[PDB]
Amino acid sequence: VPLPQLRAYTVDASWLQPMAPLQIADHTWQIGTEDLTALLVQTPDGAVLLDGGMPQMASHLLDNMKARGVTPRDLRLILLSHAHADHAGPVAELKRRTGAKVAANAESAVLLARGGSDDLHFGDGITYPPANADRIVMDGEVITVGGIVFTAHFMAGHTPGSTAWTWTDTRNGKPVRIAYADSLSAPGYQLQGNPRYPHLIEDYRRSFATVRALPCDVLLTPHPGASNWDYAAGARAGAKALTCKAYADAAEQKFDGQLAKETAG
Template identity: 35%
Template sequence: MSPCRKLLCFVIVLLSFGRLHAQMNPDWITPVAPFRIADNLYYVGSRDLASYLVVTPAGDILINSNLQSSVPQIRHSVERLGFRFSDIKILLISHAHSDHAGGSAAILKQTGAKYMVMDADVPTIQDGGRSDFAYGGRQLMPPAHVDRVLRDGDEVKLGGSVLVAHKTAGHTRGCTTWTMRVRDNGKPRDVVIVGSWNVLSEYRLVATATRPASYPGIAQDFAHGFEVLHSLPCDIFLGAHGGYFEMKEKLSRMATEGSAVWLDPEGYKRAVAEHQKEFEDKLAKQRHEGTSAR
């Protein structure tokens, strides 16, 4: 690649990040003190962009690298808890958008971790967001090499901890909900970290005479994803955004209630049902608009 072309690519990336940051929720970049959720599971993200650290005797697992600019914040949170950033051996993500995977390349460089990504999100990760069906070319991130391609139901194991990757596609083609078991005050608990259930305004769930669907099968993927979410046992409800599981409100109660605030099976069921209805309402609306346009 010529020097001019390299410069042009660099400028495009900067402009892309500039547009993203201009639209950013301030809570995405506002630090929050890291905290222990249960057992060997910790929160090391910002006030809304969630990042989780699973600590094991064989090294640690990080879920979500967040924005490219989030890496120093995540590192500071890990070290503030008394752990070493270099002990991160595996990096996982919820889905291939720049607010959850933008920092991956930097974290991989700093830690030497192995990057494991759901199959259908691998191309987007490795081309820096260019192949994303909704934002391709508009929300770029540094490309990162994927070491292990995950498939629905695959397990990620390290030091006695086991995380299961559930493909809950729609928001991205490889959107991943993670589950694991931890012990909380001596009791086994089922943890669910929701990948995403959001149908963004840019998404086309149905094909019409004038516009194709965002990708073939997107509506079926969303519907299947909600079936999966309904089927998962959940004691500790978490997600890729703090807003998914009312993190700020629960943190305000943590001083008096302790880690019990994270036990929210009913909140999980309610949130899944609410977001499923939002999806179904948008699907019905787009189908009606498509029929009316004929």
């Protein structure tokens, strides 16, 4: 009996289904796939990308940037929700192919630098090309690109480095406070007494509170379904979106159920 072959990280087709750019606000576009968020924020002083999705999405992202008028040199900054393969997958390649630099917190930078390997919960099962961060950010730190101010809100749990990013855009003449909140799920995680993450539960509870309180006229999430976005629904893509409060409440209720199931399991 030979050792097993390596298994690739395969995903639902919709996660890999390209879509054309979908405008969220005056400067903010969804440019990823139907079921993975990748946000382009376009400014008079260059563009910012928040997440890139799966590794094989680099060229599609670049096509959509081009459709928007953003050349590779115009992409200045990549920000991440968290450094798993389905959100940070193409970062290394985008850095090679654009002017983009990565800003991330220390936890995300170290996970990004090992390509998602030695994950606290997934081990080496879900990896991707490693990349280096160019700037380390602290909780509450701001980065400004052509006058869009992005604020980091750490919300550790799904990964130690999970981050919400907030900024204010405009729409129909009025401010829109956009909150790109990270995942609050714990898929197959050992929650209680995890030797690799001993304060996991406390971190999730603090993160629910952080998400609940974000400035949040519009919530977006790395998996759009988690905030009830439907990117394929066109003019009504965001009509059913949750508030940050509702998103945090739903995640906490699910988390509490998982804790009870783990105790019983």
